Amino acid sequence: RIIENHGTEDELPNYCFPLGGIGVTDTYQAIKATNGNGGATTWAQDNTFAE
Amino acid sequence: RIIENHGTEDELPNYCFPLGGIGVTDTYQAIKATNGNGGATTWAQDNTFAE
Amino acid sequence: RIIENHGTEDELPNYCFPLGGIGVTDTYQAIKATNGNGGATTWAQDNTFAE
Amino acid sequence: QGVMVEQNGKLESQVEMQFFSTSVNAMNEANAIQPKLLLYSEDVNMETPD
Amino acid sequence: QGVMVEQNGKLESQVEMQFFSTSVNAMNEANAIQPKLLLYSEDVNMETPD
Amino acid sequence: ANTFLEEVRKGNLERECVEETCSYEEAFEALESSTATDVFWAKYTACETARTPRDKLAACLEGNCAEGLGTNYRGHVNITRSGIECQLWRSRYPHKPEINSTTHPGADLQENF
Ligand SMILES: [Ca+2]
Ligand SMILES: [Ca+2]
Ligand SMILES: [Ca+2]
Ligand SMILES: [Ca+2]
Ligand SMILES: [Ca+2]
Ligand SMILES: [Ca+2]
Ligand SMILES: [Ca+2]
């Protein structure tokens, strides 16, 4: 009968999410640092990890 | 004045959905089974359904 | 003990939304009043906007 | 909500029009330029009371 | 929260640093071998109470 | 390419590389084999003159024609402008090739085509 229009109550955002919580993804490659002595450090590809 | 913490009752996860009710789809084409001439079953593109 | 279940009411949909609110987009270019004359007025590249 | 401005003693608008097309073009036949998107632009009073 | 283990009569950590670039550029020319992602790894007493 | 929501689903090489504008990356995602993939890359560098429009690129990937100077030509013509049969491209018989399949395999230089 009477509208007690106190207004809403919200001060924080609310967020839904991906079922895994991570959407995008960039493939990548393991890299090992080979000592660059006397200069810039060199880099090669690891063999332990998957490529 | 005093907080009666209980957690809450949230034992079933809730999912939102896309407005089409289906994610993404991949155009496909219809086929039909031309009777296998003894050996491998033959497959012929249909004409009844669109491309 | 007694389920006084009279259903619910959800006439108004409850669409969620994305952060920026504007997902897809498409680089376009601003065609200034590069107007031809006589016939259907032409158009061409502007230099008063980012491309 | 166009901010009315008095010119010649009469209240009128400041709305303008802006026209947009795609971005690639020379990519194909040049003059093929056509309008696709139209935006009317303007000015308003922005206030955030609460 | 990294697990502490004793060596040299002292309790220290076992955090390791691992490096990643784009296999995404797996193929192409040299020099351009630069890392872009650094990960720190560890071991922790994972435990679920309830 | 664009419409990043698309960058979740399995992209068709056509759906991600042609009409849009893909780099080597989305192409590779679609294909997963650097050999034919860099065949595609060689075409792409050749189809730099064939970036737009669609057909311009569909034919360019088809390989049935030479783009002017023929940097894209992947056919099998064995006759010169006078019909002279061409030498072996990889070998130097009878004249030494300055730029050959060891140098520019991106133009896909066959036996004598
Ligand atoms: Ca990737
Ligand atoms: Ca795309
Ligand atoms: Ca894509
Ligand atoms: Ca697209
Ligand atoms: Ca993709
Ligand atoms: Ca991706
Ligand atoms: Ca298609």
From Swiss-Prot, chain F:
Coiled coil feature spans: none
Residue stretches making up the Gla domain: 1-46
Transmembrane segments: none
Residues with PTM 4-carboxyglutamate: 6-7, 14, 16, 19-20, 25-26, 29, 32
Domain Kringle: 65-113
Domain of life: Eukaryota
Disulfide-bonded cysteines: 17-22, 47-60
Glycosites: 78, 100
The name this protein goes by in its record: Activation peptide fragment 1
Protein species of origin: Homo sapiens
Whole-protein residues included: 44 to 156 of 622
